[PDB]
Amino acid sequence: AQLKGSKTEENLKYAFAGESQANRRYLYFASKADVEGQNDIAALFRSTAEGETGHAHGHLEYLEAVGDPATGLPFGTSRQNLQSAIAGETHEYTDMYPGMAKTARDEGFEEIANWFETLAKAERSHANRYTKALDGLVD
């Protein structure tokens, strides 16, 4: 049984995206509870979020056999991980966020457009910083 091409590969990718989002959502909910004074609820969102971290990283460990879900590229070693991060970041700032900015502006969401442009610039900074780190990697 080869994981590449299987339904189970697709399911691991989907479940990795979901667990990832659940951790982000639960930390957002925790910050809302913080402000409200619901400290027990905030602590619960945070503890559950750690669970979803363990789940997402388990999914990712299985996906090491087929490639980084964001890029299709090998991951594992720091050299590979920096390479895949640079490629993904490059996609984000050359394609994804500029295209999202254009669509937002065309649909009349000017603030969201500027937000997507801020993020394109941020992902470009990330890509360039990762590239500098890869240039200096001694492994």
Residues that bind Co ion (CB under 5 A): 19, 52, 55, 123, 126
Q: How many residues bind a copy of itself (CB under 8 A)?
A: 71
Tell me if 9 is assigned to a ligand binding site. Answer: no
> Side-chain half-sphere of 69: how many Cα atoms within 13 Å?
18
Amino acid at 72: G
Tell me if 61 is assigned to a ligand binding site. Answer: no
Tell me if 59 is assigned to a ligand binding site. Answer: no
Least distance (Å) between residue 38 CB and Co ion: 19
Tell me if 123 is assigned to a ligand binding site. Answer: yes
Amino acid at 38: Q
Q: Which of 87, 88, 91, 97 is nearest to 120 (CA)?
A: 97
Tell me if 89 is assigned to a ligand binding site. Answer: yes
- Site residues for a copy of itself, 34-53, by CB under 8 A, read 36, 38, 40-41, 44-45, 48, 51, 53
Least distance (Å) between residue 94 CB and a copy of itself: 14
Contact (Cβ atoms closer than 8 angstroms) between residue 101 and residue 116 = yes
Reading the block at residue 92, the tokens are: 């984000």
Question: How far is C-alpha 21 from the geometric centre of its chain's CA atoms?
Answer: 9
Contact (Cβ atoms closer than 8 angstroms) between residue 88 and residue 125 = no
Least distance (Å) between residue 124 CB and Co ion: 9
- Site residues for a copy of itself, 53-112, by CB under 8 A, read 53, 55-58, 60, 62, 68-70, 75-78, 81-82, 85, 88, 92, 96-97, 100, 103-104, 107-109, 112
Amino acid at 3: L
Count the neighbouring beta carbons within 10 Å of the beta carbon of residue 137: 10
| Contacting residue, 72, 114, 121, 129, with a copy of itself by CB under 8 A | 129
